[PDB]
Amino acid sequence: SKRWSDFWGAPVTAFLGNVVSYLLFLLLFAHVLLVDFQP
Amino acid sequence: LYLSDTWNQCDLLALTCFLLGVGCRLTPGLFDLGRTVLCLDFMIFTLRLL
Amino acid sequence: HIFTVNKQLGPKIVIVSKMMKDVFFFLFFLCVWLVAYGVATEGILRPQDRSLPSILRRVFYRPYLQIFGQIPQEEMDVALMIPGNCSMERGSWAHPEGPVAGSCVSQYANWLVVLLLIVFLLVANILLLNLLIAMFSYTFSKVHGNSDLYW
Amino acid sequence: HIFTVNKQLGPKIVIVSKMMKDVFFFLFFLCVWLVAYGVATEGILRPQDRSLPSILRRVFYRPYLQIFGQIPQEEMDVALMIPGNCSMERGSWAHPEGPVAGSCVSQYANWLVVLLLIVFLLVANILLLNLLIAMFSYTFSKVHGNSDLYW
Ligand code: NA
Ligand code: NA
């Protein structure tokens, strides 16, 4: 239970989690806006 | 200290246009207005990545 | 790689690989702006032919050819389309030209699509391409001496 | 040659001949990339009208005009062509527009031809032309003083 907090504690993985979650936000926003937008 | 910067202001701007897009969508006669405000809002969320 | 031995074409072939960082920056800024423009004009006017490869075409492949001088006007402008009641939903519609722009296009707020076309051509044609010529001129004048020592 | 005597148009006519090494480099890199792109899109989609000057046209003369903004889209893309059983061989086919693009075009893996068009426009209209402006700016700032002493 040491290398778990070693990998996930570094700032590159907090940044990488930020970018991956933010691109999935834009993909969700695009799927809502383009494909299924019921009136 | 929040208001002084420009990307705290810009992310504030993307969320205020989001609230305006929802509140214009939920009224029954203003559907196409919210349909266009969310499109301009998607531009402001994607200029976040810079 | 065969002609790096030559006297005149030698160092100029060696230099080209040291310019690829600025092309990668340009692809970064272009893909951010290509998504931003593309989904906005796709949402504002919503076509009726909504297959997955068709909307990927008219999001990523119209604007990429727009920066090289290929601008389709008849596919996103009411004043160049013929109107008609071609849909079965509330609102006004139009009928575009070409088998890829969908069958119907909403007429609502089409002046805003004309403005997004103007802002796209400004940022892409003038802001990015002329900045890219600036970064190639600076990098080439900086690494020319080291690439002759290396060659 | 008559107007090299003049005071203002003098040295600027003398300089132009000392720039011809960089144009020769550009013709080198363009002809390598023009062959590489051209035979690949010619092999991927094989037309049925196979005269020798016709395939030399649609290998060397389409892409050379593509770097100057003349892009034919209706001659190499299924979604802009009308399909049909216009051949007598195994597979799916299409029918292009224009008397020079052949009579039939294979529909197999036409997304790869769209990708070779994108990679060609990237390397030609962005890498090579903006690198060529970089080499003219460096050479001109280097030989301007010697060409005034010579003039
Ligand atoms: Na043009
Ligand atoms: Na042009």
Swiss-Prot record, chain A:
Belongs to the transient receptor (TC 1.A.4) family. LTrpC subfamily. TRPM4 sub-subfamily. TRPM4, is a temperature-sensitive ion channel, it adopts distinct conformations at different temperatures, markedly influencing where and how ligands interact with it. Decavanadate (a positive modulator), ATP (an inhibitor) and Ca(2+) bind to different locations of TRPM4 at physiological temperatures or at lower temperatures. It is found in: Cell membrane; Endoplasmic reticulum; Golgi apparatus. Disruption phenotype: Mice have fewer dendritic cells in lymphoid organs and impaired migration of dendritic cells is seen. It comes from the Eukaryota. Signal peptide: none annotated. Sino-atrial nodes (at protein level). Widely expressed. The chain holds residues 765 to 803 of 1213 of the full protein. Phosphorylation by PKC leads to increase the sensitivity to Ca(2+). Sumoylated. Desumoylated by SENP1. This is Transient receptor potential cation channel subfamily M member 4. It comes from Mus musculus (Mouse). The chain crosses the membrane at residues 15-35. Calcium-activated selective cation channel that mediates membrane depolarization. While it is activated by increase in intracellular Ca(2+), it is impermeable to it. Mediates transport of monovalent cations (Na(+) > K(+) > Cs(+) > Li(+)), leading to depolarize the membrane. It thereby plays a central role in cadiomyocytes, neurons from entorhinal cortex, dorsal root and vomeronasal neurons, endocrine pancreas cells, kidney epithelial cells, cochlea hair cells etc. The lineage of its organism: Eukaryota, Metazoa, Chordata, Craniata, Vertebrata. Homotetramer.
